[PDB]
Amino acid sequence: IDFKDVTYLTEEKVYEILELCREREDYSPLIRVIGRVFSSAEALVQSFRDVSVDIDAIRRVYTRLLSNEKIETAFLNALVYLSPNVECDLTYHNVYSRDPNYLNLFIIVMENRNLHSPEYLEMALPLFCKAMSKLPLAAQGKLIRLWSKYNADQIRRMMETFQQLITYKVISNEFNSRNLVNDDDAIVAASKCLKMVYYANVVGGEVDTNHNEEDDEEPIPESSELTLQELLGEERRNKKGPRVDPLETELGVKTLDCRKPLIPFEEFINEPLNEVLEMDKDYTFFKVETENKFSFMTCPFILNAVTKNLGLYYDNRIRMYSERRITVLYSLVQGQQLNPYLRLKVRRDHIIDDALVRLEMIAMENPADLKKQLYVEFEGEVSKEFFQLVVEEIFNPDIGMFTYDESTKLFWFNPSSFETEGQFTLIGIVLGLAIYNNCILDVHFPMVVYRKLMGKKGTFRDLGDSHPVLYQSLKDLLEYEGNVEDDMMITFQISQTDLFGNPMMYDLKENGDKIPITNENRKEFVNLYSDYILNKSVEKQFKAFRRGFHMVTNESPLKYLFRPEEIELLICGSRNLDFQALEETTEYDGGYTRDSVLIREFWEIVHSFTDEQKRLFLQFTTGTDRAPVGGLGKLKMIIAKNGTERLPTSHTAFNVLLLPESKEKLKERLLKAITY
Amino acid sequence: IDFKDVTYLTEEKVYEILELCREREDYSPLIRVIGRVFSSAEALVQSFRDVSVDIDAIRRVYTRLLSNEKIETAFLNALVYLSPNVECDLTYHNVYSRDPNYLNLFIIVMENRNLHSPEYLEMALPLFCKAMSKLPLAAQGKLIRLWSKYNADQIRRMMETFQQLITYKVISNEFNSRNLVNDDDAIVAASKCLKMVYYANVVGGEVDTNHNEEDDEEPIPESSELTLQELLGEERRNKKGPRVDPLETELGVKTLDCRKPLIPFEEFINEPLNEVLEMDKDYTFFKVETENKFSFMTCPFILNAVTKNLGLYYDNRIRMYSERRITVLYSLVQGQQLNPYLRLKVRRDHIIDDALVRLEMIAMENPADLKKQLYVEFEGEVSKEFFQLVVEEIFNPDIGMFTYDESTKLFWFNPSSFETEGQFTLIGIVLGLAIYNNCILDVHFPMVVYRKLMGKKGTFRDLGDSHPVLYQSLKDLLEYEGNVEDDMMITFQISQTDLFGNPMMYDLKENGDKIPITNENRKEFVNLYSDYILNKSVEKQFKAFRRGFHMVTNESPLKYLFRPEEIELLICGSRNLDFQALEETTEYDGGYTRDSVLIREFWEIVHSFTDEQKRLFLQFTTGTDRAPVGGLGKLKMIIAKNGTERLPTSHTAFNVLLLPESKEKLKERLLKAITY
Amino acid sequence: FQDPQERPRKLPQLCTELQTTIHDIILECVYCKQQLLRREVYDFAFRDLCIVYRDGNPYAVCDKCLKFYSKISEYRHYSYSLYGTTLEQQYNKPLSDLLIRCINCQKPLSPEEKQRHLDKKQRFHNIRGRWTGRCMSCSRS
Amino acid sequence: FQDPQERPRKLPQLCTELQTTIHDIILECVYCKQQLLRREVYDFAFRDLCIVYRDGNPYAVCDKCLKFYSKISEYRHYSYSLYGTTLEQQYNKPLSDLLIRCINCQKPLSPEEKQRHLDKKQRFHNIRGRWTGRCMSCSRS
Ligand SMILES: [Zn+2]
Ligand SMILES: [Zn+2]
Ligand SMILES: [Zn+2]
Ligand SMILES: [Zn+2]
């Protein structure tokens, strides 16, 4: 009668819970006894059976049950004892090799809506996640492709399951550098569980496996490095590529291929992990996997925009520390002179024409040395403000490479450039050199520019943020009803304005005059013209911009860590403004301290001004009006009290400000120097 | 009646303990109550008063008391509570500046002979030692000079007090590298307490502050280093010298000045500290004093002969690591070629004449580079066996520098060398180069040679181990009774044999023929003739040997760590022989492991032979018959299994032995190669 | 010496076509153009190093530039470092079926040398997509 | 220029006897024999550096060899390193009454710079019997 040994939670167990809710009087342990074998290892292999699971069963089974109160305490304690001795069911027994049936014990446990109660996180839930994080590759692949058919709120509350755990775990422990964060296994697990949820939103959302770019021609390395591959005979085979997550390889999908997920990617971040985690050795866990520690950079979606550069700063430094260490070795054993920097001779009249033959020399002769740290020198007379000298000199309409669109307030690659790919190389290089040296720029690019760099082309979806007056005039074709041959006089040939002013007739078809557009190939007219201005009018120019960008950040994990939205806050900076964090990120060099008066005079003169004029000040200290990406005190302020009448000595790089040993004795001339 | 508030343990308290032992019936707490205020801080300042202490009182006071049983438990618990809050009586209150009276609370507590019971070491005794280790300098100076009047057994049982504590502390804890030994404060204290006992045996034993050498002419440094002192203007003032312990400076005495202590120095060693302590960072505590850690090399007497070189090996390595790092810098910025070694070109026919112009070039041109690691090269064709090529080539009578005395079986500096100071320079240098590179030599020097190098001359006491047939013939003068003018025909002039064979008449007095010896100036005849052969017949030759020795180990703490007895086991090696430690100090290089047969074949063929022939084998693996100083496995054996018929490839430096992949297939030719 | 299939790729493939023993092969480096040392001569066979053709000239390496430039690629092009276990789960192949060379001497890492890395848990090194290790001749101190 | 008392020892003692300002003093190094740089010129006064006489020639230093050879003495002749407290108990003197220079720039260590070492518990350096520190110009990154 009691049905103990046979499979639990079935429709037979639905009638058993219904008839044991019949005659409720003194029924205290019988419901937990008739749900206890649900909390068993092999009893969910067998019960409820590209899978063999009945989702149509269980999501009505749990509904019938909730007319009581103690069963969530009864569901809990069985799973405390389930989870370790089922963790070794794949750690040691390795049962996915033995069956594809096995996954069903996760889903039935997962669909409990009273998991929303936080009483599981004492011990119960995370070790259920740990074996779920210890699943093998194709085991995770079918599991994720099972979750490619969810609704968003099913993914949302499943996302909110692990996020609430990593809400719980930061308020659990005080983490330190002897109190390491990668040795705690649950946050390793739950984020790796959330990675599958994050990779669910890839394959569950908008998919475009097709419109990738031309595969980026990885740079020819130097004559020494080419030699060694011929010495090792591996000149036949090519590189296996960058850092690649295996779930990208296991599902065969890329997150770059995802246009829109179920719920957008920026919601999938743990923020309080970031503010307590040091990526100084988490990046050491990234390039060097360790025994009892795992890298959070292999779950990059959990990090906000504040944090993913902070490891990329650490990544470039180890490529710069090594490129310091290389020319150590060349002066030692080869006797070739110590060149520990990317020195950059320029003249302010010719900095494009200076750095073109400068960089393309290093882009030809020794392609390695671009990974050395940037160091700018003028004639006569730095590197942070150097980019500002380039940016409007490159984003000038008068230099002939870009157009500004006033409504969108963003730039765009002008396709009317003739033999300007050389100057298009540098804007790629300086875009890498800004990123690689971690500097901020005042750049207004559409996101399609960042979208096209990572490896996915421009679509109809990217056309609006580029220029909507074209984009509206093609969606209005698609949002029309009429017989568009008799209604509209539009054929495949168009009129594209040269900077002479004359629009140039371009048959996007093989004969755009001879074939017209109907209702059906209205889709085909978009799929030529949406890609026309965005991808293939500027295709030789963009690849020469891509080649400039690629040979700076190819060896960087920038493609791995980042999405094209995240590049925008990474190369273009942020528009926020803090000062309470500024006054605490200042070690007392020179002698001046915070509570003495001439510290708060800078604070009060910018707080007298509005935000744009505080940024007019912070152009001098940071380098530009654009803040560092995310937070403001991530670059520290630097004070200097060294011996007045004139303007204080203030750099952009080392963030210094000279100070004489009252409040309003220098501020008029100081703001004068600011607004000069 | 009870006498509570007034000063305790006095003769009034002697009659009080006697009259409270009168009528013993039910007297359980009264003796501990009448000894409790003895266990008080300020109550021993006042009681019992270059000092103001009554030793005549207390060493009969404790005698009258011991007719009972519970008072050693009663003496204990008061001192548990005394010791921390009296540790800050000089750590914070700093009472030695306030009085010289204060020291009396240590001595009264110390003279308890029931401290020999080990029940103090739970908590009680070491913190009594800690404040005694926290005494200031001149506070320790009078305290030690108070203990310059002890008997030996009073020092012995006081030595055995702290040694039994450091017997207790090693069996207390399992010490590691995360389980540091210098952060434990009691062993820091008790050894620093034992240092005073060790420095008691200096000033309590035989003192000779007078017969120091000529002050060793510290070498002229290189032209770069001389320049910087002229750039810093400090060419006026000289160096303050080596590592110097402040108690040597506080007492004004040196341990080198001590001929014989109360009980000899070699008894003052903790052996089980040495076998658990790593000097890898204890030497880092030696050159760099730290916050919560103190260097045991500042108590060098606690270490045996096994251990004091093990830090001196680490000391030379940091002088060799830096001298590697220096020629790193010269090839970098000066562009002067990487010279990371003391390369040594020789020809086996001329190695003295090779290394004389070799070393004296570096002893003149760049005096720094002798601290670089030794590297020997012949023409045509190493550095460990190189010294063996020098030793008999220097200790030959046929090379004309030394004589061998067959009875004593030791060498001696022959004073009959004419213009041989150049060859006397090298034997100093090679003696340093053996030590600095930590190599063992087969040298038979008298201890006076090591005695004269550290800074104390040769006495009558050192004459016997040099050559007793002279030494007996002057003590027999002193152990005679007769009127030695009418009895003995001896005047101050002597007959000293040249290697021509002719004895040379030498008036040791200003006119040794004209003044004869009587009973009184028989002392004066020794004090000329004891120093004659030992110090001043060879004085120009010994200093040229000293100058050779000095400019190799001046910057080393060899003078600090070591006594002239300890140099003998340090430069001359040891005559012990282990093999069980040899077979465990062999990591399996090549492929051969221990339990396979050809490992124990070396063991069994040397264990078939007697000891001298096992040393005939170990001349090939270590370098000579002389063992490493102290233990045998301190140099590791090295096995090699790489691909036979011929003799195995076996080095002296890297201790390698080639092995083909049975037991008696190669041993005849192997022992043949050994005994060739 | 121009077409790939006619010129030999290894010194065992060369020495008969180039009419020599392993000893008296006449060769010049790619960096230093010097007569290679005889220990260096023999290893280019054993370490299975591959013949460079600069201007139709069969070049080899010298060892002191071989260990140098391998240290250059180690410092300049280092992607990640992986356990010895982590290839058999991610490349999913036996390591003796895998061409992993030495990071210093560039001899292909031995079947027992690779099992040290699973025994003593020591990590490999990935550079330029290629895999590297530490050989037993490159394990002395 | 030969007898010690007639030739001046410092540039403030020199510049009047050698008839100049602090700016237009004509000097050559001891290592490089070059016209010293003007920041370098002014510091030899302020860092109180002392005039070398090679063959009766008043020599000074250049800074890049000054910081070099001070690093040489740091690496070659290093005796022990001591807390800022540990001089006032063992030398038993005030540190402002003590000539401690910089280990890098060889300016005499400032009375506030020495109190950093008792504040932040940072250790001095003894070399050649002389004492050294780290100045505030030599504390940037
Ligand atoms: Zn070569
Ligand atoms: Zn190797
Ligand atoms: Zn100079
Ligand atoms: Zn300085």
CSV table of C-alpha atoms in Angstrom, one decimal, chain B residues 137 218-219 221-236 238-244 246 286-292 318-319 322-323 325-326 329-330 333-334 368-369 555, chain D residues 4 7 9 30-31 44 48-54 59-61 65-66 68-83 86 89-92 101 106 121 123 126 128-130:
chain,number,residue,atom,x,y,z
B,137,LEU,CA,72.9,45.6,27.9
B,218,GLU,CA,91.4,44.7,5.4
B,219,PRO,CA,91.9,44.6,1.6
B,221,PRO,CA,88.6,47.4,-2.5
B,222,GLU,CA,88.3,48.0,-6.2
B,223,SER,CA,88.7,51.3,-7.9
B,224,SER,CA,85.0,51.7,-8.3
B,225,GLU,CA,84.3,51.1,-4.6
B,226,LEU,CA,87.2,53.3,-3.4
B,227,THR,CA,85.7,56.1,-5.6
B,228,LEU,CA,82.3,56.0,-3.9
B,229,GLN,CA,83.8,56.5,-0.4
B,230,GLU,CA,85.6,59.5,-1.8
B,231,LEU,CA,82.3,60.5,-3.3
B,232,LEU,CA,80.7,60.0,0.1
B,233,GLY,CA,83.7,61.6,1.9
B,234,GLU,CA,84.1,58.7,4.3
B,235,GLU,CA,87.7,57.9,3.3
B,236,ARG,CA,88.7,59.5,6.6
B,238,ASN,CA,87.4,53.2,8.5
B,239,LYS,CA,85.0,50.3,8.7
B,240,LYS,CA,83.3,49.4,11.9
B,241,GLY,CA,84.1,45.8,11.1
B,242,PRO,CA,82.2,42.6,10.8
B,243,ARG,CA,79.1,41.2,12.4
B,244,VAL,CA,79.7,41.9,16.1
B,246,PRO,CA,76.8,43.6,21.4
B,286,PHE,CA,70.7,36.8,10.6
B,287,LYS,CA,71.4,39.5,8.0
B,288,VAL,CA,67.8,41.0,8.3
B,289,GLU,CA,66.5,41.2,11.8
B,290,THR,CA,62.7,40.8,11.8
B,291,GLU,CA,59.7,41.7,14.0
B,292,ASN,CA,58.6,38.5,15.7
B,318,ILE,CA,73.9,34.9,-1.2
B,319,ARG,CA,77.3,36.5,-1.8
B,322,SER,CA,74.7,38.7,-5.7
B,323,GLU,CA,78.0,38.4,-7.5
B,325,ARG,CA,73.7,39.6,-10.1
B,326,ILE,CA,76.5,42.1,-10.3
B,329,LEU,CA,74.4,44.6,-14.3
B,330,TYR,CA,77.8,45.1,-15.9
B,333,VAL,CA,74.5,48.9,-18.5
B,334,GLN,CA,78.3,49.0,-18.8
B,368,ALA,CA,85.7,41.5,-5.5
B,369,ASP,CA,85.6,38.7,-8.0
B,555,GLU,CA,82.8,39.6,4.5
D,4,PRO,CA,93.0,68.7,1.3
D,7,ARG,CA,90.6,72.6,-2.3
D,9,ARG,CA,85.0,69.6,-0.5
D,30,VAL,CA,84.6,60.7,-12.3
D,31,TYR,CA,83.4,57.9,-14.4
D,44,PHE,CA,75.8,67.4,-5.8
D,48,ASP,CA,76.3,66.9,-0.1
D,49,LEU,CA,78.5,64.7,-2.4
D,50,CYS,CA,82.2,65.0,-2.0
D,51,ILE,CA,84.8,65.9,-4.6
D,52,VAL,CA,87.1,63.2,-5.9
D,53,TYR,CA,90.6,64.2,-6.9
D,54,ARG,CA,92.0,61.9,-9.6
D,59,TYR,CA,85.6,65.3,-10.2
D,60,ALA,CA,81.9,64.8,-9.5
D,61,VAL,CA,79.5,62.0,-10.5
D,65,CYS,CA,76.4,56.1,-12.6
D,66,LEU,CA,75.7,57.4,-9.1
D,68,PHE,CA,74.4,52.5,-10.5
D,69,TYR,CA,77.5,52.3,-8.2
D,70,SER,CA,75.3,52.7,-5.2
D,71,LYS,CA,73.4,49.7,-6.3
D,72,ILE,CA,76.8,48.0,-6.8
D,73,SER,CA,77.8,48.7,-3.2
D,74,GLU,CA,74.3,47.5,-2.2
D,75,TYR,CA,74.8,44.2,-3.9
D,76,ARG,CA,78.4,43.7,-3.3
D,77,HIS,CA,79.1,45.0,0.3
D,78,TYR,CA,75.9,44.4,2.2
D,79,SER,CA,76.4,43.7,5.9
D,80,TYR,CA,73.0,43.7,7.6
D,81,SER,CA,69.7,45.5,7.6
D,82,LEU,CA,68.3,47.2,10.7
D,83,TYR,CA,65.0,48.8,11.9
D,86,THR,CA,67.6,49.6,16.2
D,89,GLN,CA,69.4,51.5,20.9
D,90,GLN,CA,72.7,50.2,19.4
D,91,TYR,CA,74.4,53.3,18.1
D,92,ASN,CA,72.5,55.1,20.9
D,101,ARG,CA,72.4,58.8,3.2
D,106,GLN,CA,72.9,59.3,-1.8
D,121,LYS,CA,58.6,49.7,10.6
D,123,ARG,CA,64.5,48.7,7.8
D,126,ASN,CA,74.3,49.0,6.5
D,128,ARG,CA,80.7,49.1,4.3
D,129,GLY,CA,80.1,50.4,7.8
D,130,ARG,CA,78.1,53.2,6.4
